[model samples]
Target: MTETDKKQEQENHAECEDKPKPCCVCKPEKEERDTCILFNGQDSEKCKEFIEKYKECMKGYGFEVPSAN
Candidate 1:
């Protein structure tokens, strides 16, 4: 890559690196089950059990969980 391109890439990477990563109540919901964002936003009968589990994890991460109702 050209010197200019390499410098631009490094700047872009630095911008992202300084910010916090996206958060999820549960790692399983985010990486494995794929219900992190959806379940956090709205009620889901099917996801009740998993969300309950995530609520427990929320405390560990200092996250305030909304009512999973």
Candidate 2:
């Protein structure tokens, strides 16, 4: 009975965690995207390359970055 209870407890406690936040994981890409946008006076068209690069970087980590319509 004790052995069974121990096995049951082990099954109940199994889990995991993710260390980095989405924002924290993509800092370099984010900075590049930000700089591009700022330099282009916030015009997304002029900053598309950086924006897409950042989006791809985030996607590489399994993030779902929604595309602009």
Instruction: Provide the overall lDDT of each model, using Cα atoms, as 2-decimal numbers.
Output: 0.49, 0.59
Model 2 misplaced stretches (Cα beyond 4 Å): 1-21, 43-45
What digit string (tens of lDDT, one per residue) describes model 1 on residues 1-69?
A: 446443343355333332134355335554533544455653545655754565566657655544423
Q: Superposing all C-alpha atoms, what RMSD in Å does each candidate have to the true structure?
A: 9.8, 11.9
- TM-scores for all candidates: the values are 0.32, 0.44
- Lowest summed-lDDT stretch of 10 residues in model 2? 11-20
- The worst-scoring run of ten residues by lDDT in candidate 1 lies at 13-22
Candidate 2 to native Cα RMSD, angstroms:
11.9
Compute the lDDT of residue 24 as modeled in candidate 1: 57
lDDT by residue (tens digit), candidate 2, 3-65:
534334344234332223555555676776677777778765777787567656666865656
Task: Kindly provide the TM-score of model 2 when superposed on the true structure, using C-alpha atoms.
Answer: 0.44
